[PDB]
Ligand binder design. Sequence first.
Ligand SMILES: Cc1ccc(S[C@@H]2O[C@H](CO)[C@H](O)[C@H](n3cc(-c4c(F)c(F)c(O)c(F)c4F)nn3)[C@H]2O)cc1
Length: 138
Amino acid sequence: PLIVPYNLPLPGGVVPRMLITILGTVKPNANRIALDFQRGNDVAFHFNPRFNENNRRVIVCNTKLDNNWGREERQSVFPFESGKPFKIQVLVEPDHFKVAVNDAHLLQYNHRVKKLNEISKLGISGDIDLTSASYTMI
Ligand SMILES: Cc1ccc(S[C@@H]2O[C@H](CO)[C@H](O)[C@H](n3cc(-c4c(F)c(F)c(O)c(F)c4F)nn3)[C@H]2O)cc1
């Protein structure tokens, strides 16, 4: 187990067929989780499960460019549960990130930041116990 926030380096950025796996357990009474794939200060892909946004659960996805958030993409399908272990898998594809949670497909997010080879850090934050963060090619 590791303590969050945690920064996972992605040396040389990301590339298609790179699979990033984040394992952890959601705390009881969690409010939020955040994964931030960063190109310097820009956030290419922000993946933000919110456990209570207006009394519902939603996943918010976005990009931050020059410190400004863009247009959000929201997913109501919500595979996380307070107190339960999870696996987030982010598969880099040519035109999008593909996310699966607990071995079930969840969402795709098209690349807004084009320079994949400069998306060189993944930040992991929020109401979790972090078990592991790693990557491999498939
Ligand atoms: C016009 C406008 C008005 C309001 C908003 S709200 C905004 O929405 C964004 C996604 O579009 C991001 O989610 C932002 N955000 C969340 C975290 C964060 C964090 F700082 C942590 F320390 C965590 O542990 C954690 F899990 C987090 F999520 N940082 N920035 C959010 O402030 C947008 C536009």
